[PDB]
Structure formats: C-alpha cells, structure tokens
Amino acid sequence: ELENIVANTVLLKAREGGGGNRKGKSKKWRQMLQFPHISQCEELRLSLERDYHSLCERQPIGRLLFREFCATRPELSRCVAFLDGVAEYEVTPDDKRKACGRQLTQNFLSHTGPDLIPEVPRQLVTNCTQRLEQGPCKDLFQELTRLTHEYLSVAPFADYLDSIYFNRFLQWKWLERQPVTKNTFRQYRVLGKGGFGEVCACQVRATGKMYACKKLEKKRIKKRKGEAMALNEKQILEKVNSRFVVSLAYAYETKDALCLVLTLMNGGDLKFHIYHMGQAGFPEARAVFYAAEICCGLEDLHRERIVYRDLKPENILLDDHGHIRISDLGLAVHVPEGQTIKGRVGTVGYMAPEVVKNERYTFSPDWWALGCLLYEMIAGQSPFQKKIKREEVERLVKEVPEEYSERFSPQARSLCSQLLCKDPAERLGCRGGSAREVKEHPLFKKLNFKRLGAGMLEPPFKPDPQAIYCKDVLDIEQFSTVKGVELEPTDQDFYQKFATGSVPIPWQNEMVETECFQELNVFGLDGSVPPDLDWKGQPPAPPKKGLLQRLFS
Numbered sequence: 001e002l003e004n005i006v007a008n009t010v011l012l013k014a015r016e017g018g019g020g021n022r023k024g025k026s027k028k029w030r031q032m033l034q035f036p037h038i039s040q041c042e043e044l045r046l047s048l049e050r051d052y053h054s055l056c057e058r059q060p061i062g063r064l065l066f067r068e069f070c071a072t073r074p075e076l077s078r079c080v081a082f083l084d085g086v087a088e089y090e091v092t093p094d095d096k097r098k099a100c101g102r103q104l105t106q107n108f109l110s111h112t113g114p115d116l117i118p119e120v121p122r123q124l125v126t127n128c129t130q131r132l133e134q135g136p137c138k139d140l141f142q143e144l145t146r147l148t149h150e151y152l153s154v155a156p157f158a159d160y161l162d163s164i165y166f167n168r169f170l171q172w173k174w175l176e177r178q179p180v181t182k183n184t185f186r187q188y189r190v191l192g193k194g195g196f197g198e199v200c201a202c203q204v205r206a207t208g209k210m211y212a213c214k215k216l217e218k219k220r221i222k223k224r225k226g227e228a229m230a231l232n233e234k235q236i237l238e239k240v241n242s243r244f245v246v247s248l249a250y251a252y253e254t255k256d257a258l259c260l261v262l263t264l265m266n267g268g269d270l271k272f273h274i275y276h277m278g279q280a281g282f283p284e285a286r287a288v289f290y291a292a293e294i295c296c297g298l299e300d301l302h303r304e305r306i307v308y309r310d311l312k313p314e315n316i317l318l319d320d321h322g323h324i325r326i327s328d329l330g331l332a333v334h335v336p337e338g339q340t341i342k343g344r345v346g347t348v349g350y351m352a353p354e355v356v357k358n359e360r361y362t363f364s365p366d367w368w369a370l371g372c373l374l375y376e377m378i379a380g381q382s383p384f385q386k387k388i389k390r391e392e393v394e395r396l397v398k399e400v401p402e403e404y405s406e407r408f409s410p411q412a413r414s415l416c417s418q419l420l421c422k423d424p425a426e427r428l429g430c431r432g433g434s435a436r437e438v439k440e441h442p443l444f445k446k447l448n449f450k451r452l453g454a455g456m457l458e459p460p461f462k463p464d465p466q467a468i469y470c471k472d473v474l475d476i477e478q479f480s481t482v483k484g485v486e487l488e489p490t491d492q493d494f495y496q497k498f499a500t501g502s503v504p505i506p507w508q509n510e511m512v513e514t515e516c517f518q519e520l521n522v523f524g525l526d527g528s529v530p531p532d533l534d535w536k537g538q539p540p541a542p543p544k545k546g547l548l549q550r551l552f553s
C-alpha cells in the first residue's frame with residue numbers, strides 16, 4: 001500500500017514547484033552547465049553551416065542571441081522591433097487591426113525620422129500606405145518583411161557571426177551536444193504501459209523541467225524485431241514541430257532500454273477521460289473542440305507528407321491548460337509526393353476499410369479514424385467494438401453503416417457520417433480539399449480555426465492540476481520478461497543510430513523557459529563592482545568615498 005500514495009504525492013510536489021527557490025533544479029546545476037573553453041568550440045564552429053534561417057530564425061537561443069546582438073546597433077534594433085510589430089499585426093483581430101497597423105506605419109515608415117533600410121524604393125513606401133487604409137489585409141507588409149530579412153541575412157548576419165555573441169552561441173551549442181545518459185534525469189512512478197516498456201515521468205536535473213520518458217526495452221525489441229518501428233517513431237518525432245504533436249527532447253540509452261523524452265502531457269489520455277470519468281462520453285461542445293484540434297494535428301502531419309495510421313483514444317493526451325497532442329507514432333509513415341503506399345497496420349476498429357482490404361492509400365485512414373474517434377467521444381462507445389471477437393468487427397466495418405444513439409445533433413451526425421464514408425475517394429478530407437474541407441464543415445460554427453492553431457482559444461474544460469489522470473502502479477500489467485536472448489554486436493550499431501542525444505530546438509526552449517539561459521548567458525554583471533583597492537592594496541585616484549567611511553567614524 002505504502003508505495004502508491006508515496007510516488008503520487010511525490011509527483012504532485014514536482015508538478016507543483018519542486019524544491020523552493022530552485023524550481024526543480026539540482027543544487028549544483030550551475031556546474032552541470034558550466035560553459036566550455038572557447039577552444040573547445042572551434043571544432044563545432046566548423047561543423048555548423050553559415051545558414052541565416054538556421055541560426056537566427058529556427059533556433060530559439062540562436063534567434064535570442066541574434067536579437068541581443070542587434071539591440072546594440074540602433075539601425076538593427078529598429079529593424080527587429082519592426083518585424084516584431086508586423087508579426088503581431090498579422091495576428092491582430094480585424095476590428096483592432098487598422099488601429100494597430102497605423103501606429104507601425106507612423107513609427108517605422110515616417111519619412112521624417114532616420115530611414116529604416118539603406119535602400120528603400122519610395123514607391124513601395126507610398127504604395128503600401130494607400131493599400132492599408134482601404135482594406136488592411138494580412139500580407140500588407142510581406143513586401144517589406146521580405147526586404148528586411150534580405151538586409152539582415154547579409155552583412156548584419158556576417159557581423160554577428162564574427163561577434164562575441166556568436167561565440168557565446170557556440171558555447172550554448174556545445175552544451176546541447178553533450179552526452180545524455182541515465183544521469184541527466186530523475187525518475188518517478190510509471191504512467192502507463194507502452195508497446196516496448198513503461199512510460200514514467202522524469203525531470204531534467206539541471207533545468208528542472210518536466211518530461212515523459214517512453215522507455216523501450218532493448219530485449220523486448222529484438223524479440224519482436226521492431227527495430228525500424230522504434231527508429232521510425234524517433235526520427236519522425238524529431239522532425240515534427242507542431243503544437244498538436246508531442247515534441248521529443250532527448251534520445252538516449254541505458255543498459256536495458258532506449259528512451260524517448262517527450263512533452264509531458266499532464267491531463268493523461270482520452271481513453272481515460274471517456275471511460276473512467278463517471279458517466280461515459282463528453283458533451284457536444286467538448287468532443288467538437290478536441291476533434292477540431294486533432295484535426296489541425298492531422299493537418300500538420302499531412303502537411304509534412306506523413307500519415308499517422310493510429311489515431312485512437314490511447315494516443316490523444318492532454319496538457320495542463322487542457323489542449324491535446326497526438327502521441328505514439330510507432331505506426332506512422334512518410335508518403336512521398338506523387339505516390340501511394342500499401343500497409344495493413346493499426347488498431348482494430350480504427351483501421352479504415354481500404355486498410356483492412358489491404359489496398360493502396362495515402363491519408364484516408366487518418367480522416368476515417370477521426371470519425372471513429374469523434375463518434376467514440378459523443379456516443380461513449382466504439383462504433384464497432386462487452387468483448388467482441390476479431391474477424392467480426394472487420395466485417396462490421398467493411399459493409400455495415402454506423403448506428404446513431406440519441407445524443408448526436410443534426411450536424412454532429414452529418415460530419416461523423418461523411419468521415420465514416422466507406423468509400424475512400426469520397427470520404428471527407430480525401431476528396432481533394434485536405435483539411436480545408438473538414439474545417440469548413442458547419443459543425444465548427446463558433447470556432448475560429450486561425451486562432452485555435454495559435455492555441456488562443458480556451459478549451460471548455462481545464463483539468464485540475466492537483467489530479468493524476470491515470471491508474472495506480474499495481475493496477476498496470478507487465479508481460480513476461482522472457483529470457484533466452486542475448487544482445488549481439490549488430491544491435492550496438494543500431495543503438496548508435498538511435499541515441500542522438502538532445503534534440504536542438506526543444507532542448508533550447510527548455511533552456512529558455514527554465515530561465516537557465518537568461519540566468520547563465522548574461523555576462524558582465526556579477527563581480528564587476530570596481531574594486532576598493534588596486535592589486536597592490538592601494539586606493540585609486542581618487543579613493544572610493546564609501547571605503548573611507550568604513551575605516552573611521
């Protein structure tokens with residue numbers, strides 16, 4: 001008994017605040033994150049490409065340092081501010097947009113004050129001013145935005161690369177490139193049973209940020225020969241950078257397992273929220289909201305020529321504020337432009353007709369599963385799965401249309417139905433509109449999609465922070481740890497391929513949030529209080545006025 005309540009309260013403290021001043025941070029982090037010697041970077045300097053878009057735009061710390069560098073030179077300092085303005089304007093609602101836009105116009109484009117960029121054609125200045133007033137469109141400034149970046153990305157770029165700031169960046173880079181091992185994290189109670197090992201929470205000792213650790217047991221992998229299936233999930237997760245898919249931050253090995261460190265979703269899975277949450281299912285508004293999100297998620301994966309192939313309740317999780325992210329991408333795969341793929345894989349009941357039939361496809365199955373899941377949310381039960389045997393369900397799918405209980409509204413039916421159309425080439429989404437058409441379904445009346453993608457819409461249910469949304473430890477299974485299997489040289493080569501260590505972007509963001517960046521990066525503030533006496537114990541000319549007062553009365 002003891003054990004459960006323990007790890008439970010433990011986790012809550014960590015999720016709460018941790019250890020007081022040190023927000024989860026180990027009492028010796030400053031050391032864990034001590035920068036390397038400048039010379040230790042020279043190697044890494046040569047490796048990194050001199051690519052503007054890479055160093056100044058994609059890599060948060062990179063960008064930050066670049067901004068920080070710009071802050072010094074007024075001509076740049078103002079370029080940056082300008083970009084930050086447009087970026088805002090381009091998300092500012094219509095009723096306020098014109099008011100906001102005009103301020104930037106008068107601030108940065110004033111023909112009176114110092115000029116913005118070295119060579120700006122007077123045409124495009126006035127040309128923009130006009131187009132503004134009559135109908136303030138999104139891409140109003142794109143002309144200048146493009147020109148601005150063109151400016152920076154040349155000489156002010158080279159300048160930064162050849163600045164101290166860039167050295168500082170190299171240091172930061174070195175840190176992320178450092179080996180990661182068991183030691184980098186703390187462990188906690190498990191959270192669920194994965195396909196290849198337990199998933200438990202974990203904290204980065206040095207930064208104190210929370211993560212999930214998907215463990216995949218080295219042995220259980222060779223037995224099932226699911227070596228690709230692992231590497232696959234990783235390589236994908238690595239590439240992805242969507243708001244609706246869990247980001248991966250680390251990939252490392254232990255004696256027994258390979259690990260994926262993932263965005264810790266505190267609200268648990270939907271399989272929990274539907275079944276073990278009093279009466280089954282969700283009110284319309286709610287189920288809608290999720291589908292709507294999961295929609296964008298799918299959009300994003302598809303926009304990246306990737307098909308999920310495993311949308312279901314086990315694999316939709318919730319964050320602290322109450323948004324969702326698709327997870328477990330073991331089955332996912334990349335669809336080359338202008339091509340199709342055959343593959344009979346998934347979870348029974350959620351696999352689309354053409355899948356079961358072993359037919360070629362692209363993105364169909366996902367939109368199918370969204371139906372299945374949207375159904376399973378409102379209805380409170382799988383539309384096809386009381387325990388039912390294997391083959392029958394497959395048949396039940398191939399031919400038998402869906403049956404509605406009295407919970408579905410007029411429109412709630414129309415969507416689910418269109419998504420559960422057994423004819424792939426006529427199924428909603430797959431018709432030739434991608435997500436665009438699914439979004440345009442009238443069910444999503446009072447939801448502004450542009451905003452939802454920014455996460456600027458409040459979810460109709462905020463989880464209780466003090467709650468743990470999953471089973472207790474001894475209430476979770478464990479398959480027989482079959483012996484009679486020994487790891488051989490050939491496997492190590494793969495383990496090399498797998499454990500990349502820290503993932504650049506997410507690593508960096510962690511650094512920023514946990515404030516380590518700002519706390520550690522800044523140089524020239526500590527110890528800079530100009531000494532009372534010189535090296536030979538003498539006062540300067542003239543002697544510190546406060547010092548005398550400390551030696552007399």
Ligand SMILES: Nc1ncnc2c1ncn2[C@@H]1O[C@H](COP(=O)(O)O)[C@@H](O)[C@H]1O
Binds near residue numbers: 192246262314315328
């Ligand atoms: N990032 C995460 N945050 C919280 N729980 C998770 C996370 N990833 C997986 N789990 C839980 O562990 C189970 C097994 O992981 P998976 O096999 O990846 O779905 C899932 O069904 C979830 O309940």
